[PDB]
């Protein structure tokens, strides 16, 4: 992905968990983060705690999104999904989608990784593989910091 696209593909149908939502009911009024996880990785079950944190810390002042990739048997069945994100306390909506509309646009080969977005929807940075979130929570900071 070039930085400064617009939020194309916001949407799922396998599953969804706690919500889902469209660009245009998330962009207009405070940016936002989209991340992408996985079930069956050793680093997304470390993002996952942190992402409950971060919701909390950032939700009055940031969106926050989650979309699953299918990728392993473990994370295929999305009864699994909504059984280990309840755990993990994750409120976020998040959505599961079997046509992979996102991967027509982004192309997802990653996982965990995290995207960035201002206000208007622009994408303003992209990271993966980090030590969970704790990286990005300073990138957001710095996001905050371009939208206010």
Not at 1 to 9: A, G, T, V, W, Y
Not at 69 to 96: C, N, W, Y
Request: net charge negative.
């Amino acid at each position: 992905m070039k930085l400064r696209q617009p939020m194309p593909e916001l949407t799922g149908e396998k599953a969804w968990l706690n919500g889902e939502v469209t660009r245009e009911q998330l962009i207009g009024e405070k940016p936002t983060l989209i991340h992408f996880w996985s079930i069956s990785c050793h680093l997304c079950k470390e993002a996952m705690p942190q992402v409950n944190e971060f919701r909390d810390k950032y939700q009055d002042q940031l969106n926050v999104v989650a979309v699953h990739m299918p990728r392993s048997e473990d994370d295929l069945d999305p009864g699994k999904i909504k059984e280990t994100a309840a755990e993990h306390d994750i409120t976020q909506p998040i959505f599961v989608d079997s046509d992979h509309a996102l991967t027509d646009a982004f192309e997802n080969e990653y996982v965990p990784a995290y995207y960035v977005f201002d206000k208007t929807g622009q994408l303003r940075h992209f990271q993966a593989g980090g030590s969970g979130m704790k990286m990005l929570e300073k990138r957001v900071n710095r996001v905050l910091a371009e939208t206010e």
